[PDB]
Write a protein that binds this ligand. Structure first.
Ligand code: CDL
Ligand code: CDL
Ligand code: CDL
Ligand code: CDL
Ligand code: PC1
Ligand code: 3PE
Ligand code: 3PE
Ligand code: 3PE
Lengths: 50, 459, 347, 63, 55, 52, 98, 120, 140
């Protein structure tokens, strides 16, 4: 690629964004378990947030 | 926050692998892309902060500081590429790497959920700033100024280290989210007196407190332009951010420990403003004006009312933009006359009319003209200190006279009168310089349309 | 020196330190210290000038006095316990004499008065051996007798070492005396946390040996013994100025560097034991060490002192010196703070 | 992010950090009690091994 | 008077002169082995009789 | 750092001269053999803090 | 404790304070150091004989041998100083003040 | 502190019960940071001998990365082992001494009286 | 000289002025003898008379500092009737600092010693009050 250097910061964004989403699944202890937001699962659904 | 940490780190291979004619343009482009992405921090809620992980979070206090931090890096690159044009290529890349490393320390200073990680990043911000001042400053006094900047900060902050580890042992944690809910009242004692001093004096040095401010009209004067921009726009605000995080743990003792410091600020903003009436060095005039404006943020944090915290964070963001623009204007003259003496080059509206319009707008936002966010923060601190004591308005209002008087005298000396005859190298304003002025001023005026994003955690 | 004789003598230095580390009898402790001194004397007299003979004489006298006080502490332990196990001592007089002997062998203040002379009198490699390898055996004996070490004595030695190693380096221009007063201050930091948590003592010792070995390796790689000859390094090798910059900022304990790692942990172990004034005054006194480190960084990396004309000849030759582990020790002395919880491997 | 996602993520963070804080306080109390009493596995400074003692009949009987 | 002299005098200048003077008192030793061991003797005597670090 | 090489390798470099109650030439007892045997067998394994 | 142990300890402290207060000669310092070693030999010997601790009887000989080897090393250092200045005066050993 | 625990089996870098613990992953961020330290060591080694920093000695840089990852994997195993031993001894001591660790009654804030301090 | 500090602290404040003054005089005299001993150790005097003159000068200086410290502190605690008050040791430490400046025949050293020794004596009083430990026993 003639402009390989102009993807170092955006891919480093996306990967970083990716890792943030990947951290959220480690902090999913109280997903659909808080007293404010707990509810019954709608059909064709397995988690409330991802 | 890892979506902002990793692009800031990828700016390091972006600046070390670029072609020699390309290392400014690529870093400016991608730092502007990071600053465009910085608006995703504005997912703020009326009840909860935006809590990313165990390590990182952001409420509405850190969010304007983060957007200002990620916005200041392209502006520092624009400001610092002219006077480092003749520089060696590897030293130029080391300069850009120091600015990138400083931004990398700052964005996880403001988002540190835990207070000793806040301390580690907060003191990691010394090393790129110290290296920038003592390596790319212009005059002889930059070594001494780097020593003062280093050893006021560390002498204030190494008690803060002991204090934070003491809170770590006593409460079990230094998570700010835990310490919102486990904070105990701090009773009157001598133990808690020196506890309060060890928590507060590092940030008093960082603001600066009047009487501790002696590092600032050296370190902000003996620095290059990017160093002055990051010092007066971000690094003075680490103190206010740290006080707004740390006075949670210091109640109710703060309600009488604040009384000397408030005096030191309420009289200090009278003195330092008055010092700006009789300064010959324009960069030192902007430095003592920075001390004068940050004294109001010290008073507003120490009276700890909601209107005071709203005005203090508004005044910190507004002073960051305003003082950074004023240092850039002083550099726009200093690149032409090669002297920081304010009486040297006069009558510059006769030669640089659009740049004189930029001087006019920066001086009007300096004197807190409504409805700029400068005036919003100024006015809200005045409201809260009037509720604190009805007499303080005198010391406020007299300050609001002198704040006008140095802001226009600086305009009258530099831009008005008859021009200096023997100076004939006054070039027309480059497109880079006016671009830098507009990227300072147009966000500052657009924030008057929607000030609620720079009003902090308790809007 | 014959290289075979040099190898056998250095293995004998190592063998003396090992016999101190691994033995269970106090006579073998004393024997390991005797073997260590007896073998390290020719390493100090490697170049055969009157300064090395003076340094080796002063080193011999202080280490011989310490060895005799050590044996008197051992013999008093034999009086009051009838046995010889290397463990706690069974008399506070024997504890005081052994703490004095080991403070002399470490050169902690006020027995520091040999360390800046002897380090100035010997070459840089033997100064590296003296300031890194010769700490390991007395700190091991202090590690094993800490149930009997008096608190007030070892803390007085610690704060007196930190203050004297702070004020000593502020007047110096010779790099070996700077490293020696840095040594005194760091030994104060290591023994201030010995009775509270000896794992942080081992941590501070390892991080100190890494940073000291980095600085002596840089001084050997540039052949620099004074400040003013270290100031010519930017015109000879500009990478070495960055290396001494980051390593001197690390030895001052500035975060995010690795030398912030021990002292912070030391404070972290001294406030759990309800000492607040003491780590505060220790950390305030460490700013003096930081100040003469900053003096060296101003002379070397952050400014450019004027060079001479003959430097242009030295541009035409690369450094053929074996810079053993210098990138490794440079990395491990600067970028190690994110791996701070590795210290549990020393428990 | 949703307010649900941030809210319950915050609660997971708070549970992890509160458990770490309670364990740090317990670690301080355990170290205090073990250094005071010496009956735990920590602070076990050595005494003489009794596997070194000779138990043979000696040259003189009164021993 | 205040922000070029007195606030400059009290915190940085007096502390800097104090560190300079203590640095010159520590490092003014004549390199004499006799005096260093006489100081070590006075150390041991103050340790035993004056501070009771052996009791 | 007491690197306990003697227990790791199973060698007896210096444990034999360490106490008076150890194995002696011609089974010569020390004058305080019994008292040291009692103090060691009391204090064995329980740690030094409890042994004091 | 025993009355002879008082005198052997006091002899060690006398030779200590002689070794800790120089006059001029490095040889007098070496003699004070070996007086310290001799007093350690005597004290260790009287304990080991007094306790009938048989295996430590080889201990003072070891305490002799090593330290006498140490003494030999010290004599060589003196000679090298004596080969530089003609005398063994400790005030000639002051080059390391600067 | 834990000197009596690792004294019955002396000089064991990883004891047998360390095998009961899950090892660090090969995608451990700590291990990747140690690999980055190896890469920086390779770059400093090219810089101090005036080689082309990114290009020269790729076998040497790869052995730097390999050696730091290899040593750091065992160092992380020992780190995780020692914190596991720390928590195990903590919990066994809390279980073995209930007279020192009472279960404290958690009062609700309807009963808990705190003094109010007004900001005015 | 551990019992010297104890017999200084055993008398309550503002109660027995003479023995407090004597105890602080004796503590200052001990500290002055320590400074004198190390001073004639590391710096050789030109004569025995010069050595005992340096010893008497430093011992009398530090003893006068201690005497005027204890006197000013106890008289301030008497006339203010506040025994557990660190302002009393602040005034006493500043009086000892003026004493050190009068012994060194200089006013700048006097003001510096006033400020730093007054803050030091105030910190020592606060450490006596809230139980601050400098040589803290290992607990964990
Ligand atoms: C365990 C602790 C290990 C501690 C370090 C051990 C080595 C240092 C001590 C001896 C020494 O000086 O050796 C020289 C030393 C390199 O030091 P140097 O002179 O500065 O090297 C510069 C260039 O290598 C000069 O280039 P050259 O052209 O002259 O030779 C190229 C050379 C050629 O290499 C070879 O020839 C290798 C093959 C020979 C080995 C034996 C084969 C039989 O390449 C290399 O050596 C590449 C560098 C390898 C890395 C060196 C450092 C190792 C890791 C240190 C510990 C890191 C801990 C991190 C912890 C962080 C978290 C707390 O080591 C080697 O040459 C071999 C390293 C092998 C590492 C194996 C690690 C696992 C062992 C099990
Ligand atoms: C310590 C107390 C001061 C005593 C030492 C003074 C300096 C050395 C001296 O005597 O030099 C004369 C002499 C020769 O020096 P020189 O020729 O006069 O050089 C000065 C020039 O003449 C220049 O003319 P000058 O003599 O008129 O001016 C000297 C200047 C005097 O300054 C002035 O004349 C202008 C400034 C006014 C006075 C200073 C005001 C400071 C206010 C406090 C700071 C702000 C606090 C804010 C608090 C707000 C809330 C209340 O004083 C200094 O620069 C020294 C400042 C204090 C020294 C200790 C600082 C430690 C700081 C550690 C971090 C905290 O040096 C010696 O003989 C060396 C040995 C000194 C003898 C022993 C002195 C008494 C020690 C008693 C025990 C102290 C233990 C430690 C206490 C503190 C830590 C717990
Ligand atoms: C109760 C008894 C126990 C108390 C605690 C223990 C006592 C020691 C305190 C801490 C150590 C302080 C320094 C001691 C040595 C003195 C320095 C010296 O040799 O100066 C000569 C010399 C200075 O002469 P120079 O350089 O030729 O120039 C001077 C000018 O010609 C002209 O100079 P000048 O005529 O103006 O004056 C020169 C000299 C004269 O100094 C004086 O006359 C000042 C004497 C003390 C005045 C203040 C006393 C305040 C007492 C507390 C308040 C009383 C009431 C308290 C009530 C309870 C609390 C409420 O000034 C100095 O030496 C100042 C520098 C050292 C700071 C002294 C701070 C003393 C604080 C005492 C607190 C207690 O300095 C040196 O040679 C420096 C190198 C020395 C290195 C070795 C030092 C070892 C010290 C070890 C002490 C602890 C041993 C522990 C043994 C166990 C562990 C191994
Ligand atoms: C990376 C960091 C360490 C790099 C060391 C080597 C740097 C170097 O030589 O660069 C030159 C080289 C370009 O130059 P060159 O033409 O090849 O040769 C050198 C020239 O001759 C240069 O011309 P010259 O030597 O003739 O004269 C100019 C002079 C210019 O110098 C001067 O004029 C003197 C000094 C000027 C003022 C001081 C500036 C600041 C310097 C100190 C930095 C302090 C801040 C660090 C943090 C704060 C705490 C201290 O000297 C240099 O420029 C020498 C080259 C070194 C420059 C960069 C220094 C980096 C090392 C120090 C910072 C990093 C380590 C410490 C970090 C501490 C804790 C975070 O730059 C690069 O190659 C940069 C790296 C670009 C690619 C990065 C790829 C990263 C990939 C990561 C993923 C892959 C690995 C995965 C691992 C895990 C697997 C599981
Ligand atoms: C900018 C330069 C100046 C910086 C000033 C920084 C703040 C000023 C005061 C700092 C005091 C030292 C840190 C205090 C930490 C308190 C933590 C704590 O647990 O406190 C309660 C503890 C109380 O002890 P405790 O909490 O362990 O006791 C148990 C609780 N009670 C009390 C009920 C029994 O306080 C202390 O132990 C002592 C506090 C005061 C320490 C005084 C020594 C330092 C002297 C002043 C140094 C000033 C700065 C030096 C640099 C100047 C320039 C070079
Ligand atoms: C210089 C540069 C510019 C300035 C930069 C900042 C430097 C100063 C920073 C600290 C300012 C002083 C400390 C904070 C003041 C808090 C209020 C206070 O102390 O009031 C005076 C006090 C009144 O008594 P009270 O507060 O009731 O004391 C009992 C406490 N339970 O009065 C007393 O108790 C009597 C006096 C006691 C001594 C106090 C000494 C320690 C504090 C100063 C250091
Ligand atoms: C109070 C009494 C103090 C007595 C000791 C001080 C007198 C002194 O220092 O005397 C000088 C003496 C060196 O003798 P001098 O004459 O200088 O040598 C040249 C040849 N005539 O100096 C010495 O001998 C130095 C060592 C003397 C002992 C120091 C410790 C005790 C005295 C100080 C505390 C009291
Ligand atoms: C900057 C420098 C700041 C220095 C702050 C020092 C704070 C004072 C701490 C020491 C203190 O005064 O502690 C009080 C204590 C008396 O109380 P207590 O612990 O009960 O003593 C009985 C002993 N079983 O007393 C003691 O522990 C012993 C006496 C200590 C006196 C310290 C000052 C003496 C003079 C200078 C040396």
């Amino acid at each position: 690629r003639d402009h390989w250097i102009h993807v170092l910061v955006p891919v480093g964004f996306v990967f970083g964004y990716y890792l943030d989403r990947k951290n959220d699944e480690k902090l999913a202890a109280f997903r659909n378990k808080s007293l404010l937001y707990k509810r019954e699962l709608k059909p064709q659904e397995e988690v409330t947030w991802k | 926050m890892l979506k902002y940490i990793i692009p800031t780190m990828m700016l390091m291979p972006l600046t070390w692998l670029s072609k020699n004619s390309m290392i400014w343009i690529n870093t400016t482009l991608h730092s502007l892309l990071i600053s465009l992405t910085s608006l995703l921090l504005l997912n703020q809620f009326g009840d909860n902060s935006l809590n990313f992980s165990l390590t990182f979070f952001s409420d509405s206090l850190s969010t304007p500081l983060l957007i200002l931090t990620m916005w200041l890096l392209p502006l520092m690159l624009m400001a610092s590429q002219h006077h480092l044009s003749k520089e060696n290529l590897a030293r130029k890349k080391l300069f850009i790497s120091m600015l990138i490393l400083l931004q990398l320390f700052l964005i996880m200073t403001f988002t540190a959920t835990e207070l000793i990680f806040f301390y580690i990043m907060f003191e990691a911000t010394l090393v790129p700033t110290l290296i920038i001042i003592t390596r790319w400053g212009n005059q002889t006094e930059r070594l001494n100024a780097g020593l003062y900047f280093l050893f006021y900060t560390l002498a204030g902050s190494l008690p803060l280290l002991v204090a934070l580890i003491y809170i770590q042992n006593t409460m079990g944690s230094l998570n700010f989210l835990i310490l919102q809910y486990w904070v105990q009242p701090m009773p009157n004692s001598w133990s808690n007196t020196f506890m309060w001093l060890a928590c507060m004096m590092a940030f008093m040095v960082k603001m600066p407190l009047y009487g501790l401010h002696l590092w600032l009209p050296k370190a902000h004067v003996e620095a290059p332009i990017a160093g002055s921009m990051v010092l007066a726009a971000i690094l003075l605000k680490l103190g206010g951010y740290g006080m707004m995080r740390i006075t949670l743990l210091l109640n109710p003792i703060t309600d009488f420990m604040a009384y000397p410091f408030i005096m030191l600020s309420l009289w200090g903003m009278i003195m330092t403003s008055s010092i700006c009436l009789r300064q010959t060095d324009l960069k030192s005039l902007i430095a003592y004006s920075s001390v004068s404006h940050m004294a109001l943020v010290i008073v507003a944090i120490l009276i700890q009312t909601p209107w005071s915290y709203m005005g203090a964070t508004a005044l910190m963001i507004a002073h960051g933009l305003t003082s950074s623009m004023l240092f850039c204007l002083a550099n726009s003259n200093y690149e032409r006359v090669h002297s920081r003496t304010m009486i040297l080059a006069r009558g510059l509206q006769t030669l640089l009319p659009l740049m004189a319009a930029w001087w006019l707008l920066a001086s009007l936002t300096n004197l807190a003209l409504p409805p700029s966010i400068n005036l919003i923060g100024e006015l809200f601190v005045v409201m809260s200190t009037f509720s604190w004591s009805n007499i303080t308005i005198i010391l406020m209002g007299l300050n609001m006279v002198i704040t006008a008087l140095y802001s226009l005298y600086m305009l009258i000396t530099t831009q008005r009168g008859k021009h200096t005859h023997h100076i004939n190298n006054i070039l027309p304003s480059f497109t880079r310089e006016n671009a830098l002025m507009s990227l300072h001023m147009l966000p500052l005026l657009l924030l008057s349309l929607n000030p609620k994003i720079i009003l902090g955690p308790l809007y | 020196m014959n290289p075979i004789i040099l190898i056998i003598i250095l293995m004998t230095v190592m063998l003396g330190t090992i016999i101190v580390m691994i033995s269970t009898h106090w006579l073998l402790i004393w024997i390991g210290f005797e073997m260590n001194m007896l073998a390290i004397i020719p390493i100090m007299m490697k170049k055969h000038n009157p300064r090395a003979t003076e340094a080796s004489t002063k080193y011999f006298l202080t280490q011989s006095t310490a060895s005799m006080l050590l044996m008197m502490a051992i013999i008093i332990n034999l009086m009051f316990s009838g046995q010889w196990t290397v463990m706690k001592l069974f008399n506070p007089m024997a504890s005081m004499l052994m703490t004095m002997a080991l403070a002399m062998k470490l050169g902690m203040a006020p027995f520091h008065f040999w360390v800046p002379e002897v380090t100035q009198g010997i070459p840089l490699s033997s100064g590296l051996i003296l300031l890194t390898w010769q700490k390991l055996a007395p700190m091991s004996v202090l590690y094993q007798i800490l149930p009997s070490i008096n608190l007030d004595l070892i803390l007085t030695l610690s704060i007196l070492s930190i203050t004297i190693g702070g004020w000593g380096g502020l007047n110096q221009t010779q790099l070996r005396k700077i490293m020696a007063y840095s040594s005194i201050a760091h030994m104060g930091w290591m023994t201030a946390v010995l009775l509270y948590n000896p794992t942080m003592t081992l941590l501070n010792l390892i991080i100190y040996i890494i940073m000291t070995s980095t600085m002596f390796t840089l001084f050997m790689a540039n052949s620099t013994t004074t400040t003013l000859s270290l100031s010519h390094t930017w015109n000879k090798a500009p990478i070495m100025t960055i290396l001494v910059l980051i390593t001197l900022l690390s030895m001052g304990g500035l975060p995010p560097l690795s030398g912030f790692m021990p002292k912070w942990m030391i404070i972290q172990e001294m406030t759990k034991n309800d000492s607040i004034i003491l780590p505060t005054l220790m950390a305030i006194t460490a700013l003096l060490n930081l100040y003469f480190y900053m003096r060296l960084t101003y002379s070397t990396a952050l400014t450019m002192f004027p060079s001479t004309n003959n430097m242009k000849m030295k541009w035409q030759f690369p450094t053929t010196k074996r810079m053993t582990l210098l990138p490794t020790m440079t990395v491990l002395s600067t970028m190690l703070l994110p791996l701070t919880p590795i210290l549990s491997i020393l428990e | 992010d949703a307010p649900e996602k941030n809210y319950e993520r915050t609660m997971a963070i708070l549970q992890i950090e509160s458990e770490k804080a309670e364990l740090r306080l317990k670690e301080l109390e355990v170290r205090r009690l073990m250094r005071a009493k010496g009956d735990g596995p920590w602070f076990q400074y050595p005494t003489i091994d009794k596997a070194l003692i000779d138990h043979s009949p000696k040259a003189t009987p009164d021993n | 008077l205040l922000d070029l002299i007195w606030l400059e005098t009290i915190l940085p200048k007096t502390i800097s002169l104090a560190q300079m003077k203590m640095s010159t008192t520590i490092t003014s030793q004549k390199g004499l082995i006799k005096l260093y061991f006489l100081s070590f003797l006075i150390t041991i005597l103050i340790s035993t009789t004056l501070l009771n670090f052996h009791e | 750092p007491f690197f306990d090489v003697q227990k790791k390798l199973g060698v007896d470099l210096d444990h034999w001269m360490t106490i008076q109650s150890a194995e002696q030439p011609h089974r010569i007892p020390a004058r305080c053999h019994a008292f040291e045997k009692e103090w060691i067998e009391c204090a064995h394994g329980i740690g030094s803090i409890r042994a004091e | 404790m025993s009355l002879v142990y008082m005198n052997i300890m006091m002899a060690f402290t006398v030779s200590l304070t002689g070794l800790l207060m120089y006059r001029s000669h490095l040889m007098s310092s070496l003699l004070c150091l070996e007086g310290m070693m001799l007093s350690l030999f005597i004290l260790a010997t009287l304990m080991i004989l007094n306790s009938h601790f048989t295996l430590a009887s080889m201990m003072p000989i070891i305490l002799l041998v090593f330290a006498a080897c140490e003494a030999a090393l010290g004599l060589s250092l003196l000679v090298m100083v004596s080969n530089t200045y003609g005398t063994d005066y400790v005030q000639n050993l002051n080059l390391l003040q600067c | 502190m834990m000197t009596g625990r690792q004294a019955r089996a002396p000089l064991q870098f990883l004891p047998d019960e360390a095998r009961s613990l899950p090892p660090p992953k090969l995608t451990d961020p700590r291990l990747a940071y140690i690999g980055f330290l190896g890469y920086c060591s390779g770059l400093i080694d090219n810089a101090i001998r005036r080689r082309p920093v990114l290009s020269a000695g790729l076998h040497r840089q790869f052995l730097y990365i390999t050696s730091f990852v290899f040593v750091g994997y065992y160092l992380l195993k020992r780190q995780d082992y020692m914190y596991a031993v720390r928590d195990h001894d903590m919990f066994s001591y809390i279980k073995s001494h209930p007279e020192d660790f009472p279960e404290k009654d958690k009062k609700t804030y309807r009963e808990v009286f705190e003094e109010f301090h007004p900001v005015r | 000289a551990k019992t010297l500090l104890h017999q200084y602290w055993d008398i309550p404040e503002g109660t027995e002025c003479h023995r407090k003054t004597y105890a602080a005089t004796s503590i200052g005299g001990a500290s002055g003898l320590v400074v004198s001993a190390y001073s004639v150790a590391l710096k050789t005097p030109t004569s025995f008379l010069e050595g005992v003159a340096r010893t008497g000068r430093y011992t009398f200086t530090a003893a006068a500092i201690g005497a005027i410290f204890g006197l000013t502190s106890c008289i301030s605690a008497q006339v203010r009737e506040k025994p557990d008050d660190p302002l009393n040791y602040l005034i006493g430490g500043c009086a000892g600092g003026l004493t050190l400046g009068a012994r060194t025949r200089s006013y700048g050293i006097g003001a510096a010693a006033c400020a730093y020794m007054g803050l030091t004596a105030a910190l020592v009083k606060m450490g006596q009050l809230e139980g601050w430990k400098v040589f803290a026993e290992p607990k964990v």
